[PDB]
Design a protein around this nucleic acid. Structure first.
Ligand code: ZN
Ligand code: ZN
Lengths: 255, 311, 49, 34
RNA sequence: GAUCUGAGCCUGGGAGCUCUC
């Protein structure tokens, strides 16, 4: 039963480790989104493949399924997580480079500590130690599958246009930054939700195969229209809980 | 400090030393025999060694009847320990013992399982990059097992574009293929078989056919046995930045079968070894075609090793 | 933002860093400049210092 | 095996409209995503 | 003024603003 390990239910998520130390549901998810944002930011500054970022995000979601934000800050686990994902995704980044970039994002004010200072040497240990903790907490199960993998394969098969392909893959990334489907549903299923969510927003409709079978049936044998609509409902419901403008940006204002 | 997914090494009882890196312990409760491999975190310059991550990440993937099985990973109340299914013997040790006798039939079985193991790891897109009688284990029931995947990783099938740039300094000098000694970074599976060919030769010589002290010395020995490295037998071999910068004999001819004649004896056996010790990796026979060689389908036919293990 | 062929190896995948420097505008065009901009501008999710 | 996707005449899907009134008009936010 | 004695929120990201003192 290694599969059902990193796959919980709505109830289990409602009783996360952080929820044990008094952390509102909507509050915890917030930390997750922030943690994902940090990973995405540092990743781009380190010029690492999106794969490394997504992989790092997955570890984050799973890491807090055993640990709590109260004990492990999101701004601390992110650096270690990304540093680990880099190696796993055959794209390692010097520990010095990671700490340097992480400090530029977490401390835009203060100046980058000297590579000789006592403070710097400390951050190194903290990151290295935390790294070992993440590995143990995850059971050394680095191998991670992302929806993006299934999204691309589907788009090419259905002969979807670029604009539609870009959006589908785009939503696949937002799911790891806003939602926690990576801990509820398998990548294949999540991939369908993204495409289905992109189609409804793009007005594009994927016809039925020449064999009389829906598109999602070629991505997963457990996916159904009833599921997609239900999942798409939750995805959007989480999007509506966003604290910023998504209605005011509907213009062609200057810069 | 929570940690349910990482039992303490205390659950095992160390017995003896192997390979203070590898030890032979037994489960305090079940009594099961296992092999404890301590992670060498001597170079804490880049945190947990990437070499370990790969081995662990690969072992959790590879699961063949001819590949070592990774039970779990323990810790210390810290250091990391990799648990494997203990192996009574090891090809290296057996060949060292004179009391041990290998019949033409048993020998074919050893290589059959060896190549069969390589086929798996290679099919799964993985390179051992460290083939040697030392890493060739053999269970108590006479079942070959490929172990020690430290220097092992995953390669790519080059999408007909910009080649790869893997690590050059890999595989034991004695079991290191020519390409690697010339500065080849875009190698592949062929590097593993070269070691297999050298290992199959030890099945009769009971000792490394090519024992070089240096990288250049190794090439010299390979050139005196496999023959001189020339563009004729090795097309585009001159492109190597080390081809001309390294003085390589030109008169030496191929004498693989001639040297291993008094040892191997068997015709087919010699033929296979000759195809495995091919200079050019492009012409070097693969694991698949290696199993289809008459050597594995000619009297006497392969058989278990239990009979031999009795000594 | 931009799709990536899964068949490609980890060490082969392109960098996440956008071709153009992350502009500093809240316009409907910059809100989707990259993944960070969308999360920080469109969704307004920041980690703060 | 599959036919090249097409547009939908007036997305009547409650889910579609929900997104439109959330993220905005698709077509106008494509030349930016990726 | 803090700002792990807090934030709500929003215009071009604050160089905007008010909240329990
Ligand atoms: Zn702008
Ligand atoms: Zn940007």
């Amino acid at each position: 039963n290694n599969n059902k390990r990193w796959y919980f239910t709505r109830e289990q998520l409602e009783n996360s480790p952080s929820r044990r130390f008094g952390v509102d549901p909507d509050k915890e998810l917030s930390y997750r989104q922030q943690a994902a944002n940090l990973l995405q930011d540092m990743g781009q500054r380190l010029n690492v493949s999106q794969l490394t970022i997504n992989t790092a995000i997955v570890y984050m979601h799973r890491f807090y399924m055993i640990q709590s934000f109260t004990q492990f800050p999101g701004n601390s686990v992110a650096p270690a997580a990304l540093f680990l994902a880099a190696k796993v995704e055959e794209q390692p980044k010097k520990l010095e480079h990671v700490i340097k970039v992480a400090h530029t994002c977490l401390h835009p004010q203060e100046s980058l500590p000297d590579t000789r200072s006592e403070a710097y040497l400390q951050q190194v240990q903290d990151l290295v130690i935390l790294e070992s903790i993440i590995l143990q907490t995850l059971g050394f199960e680095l191998t991670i599958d992302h929806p993006h993998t299934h999204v691309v394969k589907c788009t090419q098969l259905v002969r979807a246009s670029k604009d539609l392909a870009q959006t589908s893959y785009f939503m696949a990334t937002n799911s790891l930054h806003l939602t926690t489907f990576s801990l509820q549903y398998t990548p294949p299923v999540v991939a369908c939700v993204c495409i289905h969510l992109a189609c409804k927003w793009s007005n594009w409709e994927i016809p039925v195969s020449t064999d009389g079978k829906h598109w999602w049936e070629y991505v997963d044998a457990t996916v159904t229209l009833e599921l997609l609509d239900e999942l798409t409902h939750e995805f959007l419901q989480i999007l509506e809980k966003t604290p910023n403008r998504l209605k005011r940006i509907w213009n062609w204002r200057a810069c | 400090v929570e940690c349910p997914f990482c039992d303490e090494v205390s659950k095992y009882e160390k017995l003896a030393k192997i390979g203070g890196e590898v030890f032979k312990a037994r489960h305090r409760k079940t009594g099961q025999k296992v092999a404890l491999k301590k992670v060498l975190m001597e170079n804490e310059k880049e945190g947990f060694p990437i070499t370990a991550l790969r081995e662990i990440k690969i072992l959790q993937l590879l699961k063949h009847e001819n590949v070592v099985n990774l039970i779990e990973i323990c810790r210390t109340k810290g250091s990391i320990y990799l648990v494997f299914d203990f192996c009574e013997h090891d090809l290296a040790g057996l060949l060292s013992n004179v009391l041990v006798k290998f019949t033409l039939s048993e020998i074919k079985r050893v290589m059959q399982m060896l190549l069969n193991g390589l086929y798996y790891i290679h099919r799964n897109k993985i390179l051992h990059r460290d083939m040697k009688a030392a890493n060739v284990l053999i269970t108590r029931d006479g079942v070959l097992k490929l172990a020690d995947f430290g220097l092992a990783r995953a390669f790519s099938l080059a999408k007909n574009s910009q080649p790869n740039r893997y690590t050059n300094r890999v595989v034991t000098l004695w079991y290191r293929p020519p390409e690697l000694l010339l500065g080849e970074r875009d190698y592949g599976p062929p590097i593993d078989l070269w070691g297999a060919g050298c290992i199959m030769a030890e099945m009769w010589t009971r000792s490394p056919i090519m024992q070089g002290n240096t990288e250049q010395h190794q090439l010299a020995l390979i050139s005196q046995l496999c023959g001189s490295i020339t563009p004729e037998v090795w097309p585009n071999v001159d492109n190597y930045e080390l081809y001309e910068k390294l003085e390589l004999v030109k008169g030496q001819k191929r004498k693989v079968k001639d040297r291993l004649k008094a040892y191997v004896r068997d015709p087919y056996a010699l033929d296979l070894i000759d195809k495995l010790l091919v200079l050019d990796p492009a012409q070097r026979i693969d694991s698949d075609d290696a199993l289809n060689h008459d050597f594995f389908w000619s009297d006497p036919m392969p058989s278990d090793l239990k009979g031999m293990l009795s000594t | 933002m931009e799709p990536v062929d899964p068949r490609l190896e980890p060490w082969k995948h392109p960098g996440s860093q956008p071709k153009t420097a992350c502009t500093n505008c809240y316009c409907k065009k910059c809100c989707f400049h990259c993944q960070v901009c969308f999360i920080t501008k469109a969704l307004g999710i920041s980690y703060g210092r | 095996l599959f036919a090249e996707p097409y547009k939908v005449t007036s997305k009547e899907d409650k889910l579609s409209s929900r997104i439109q009134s959330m993220l905005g008009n698709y077509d106008e936010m494509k030349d930016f995503i990726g």
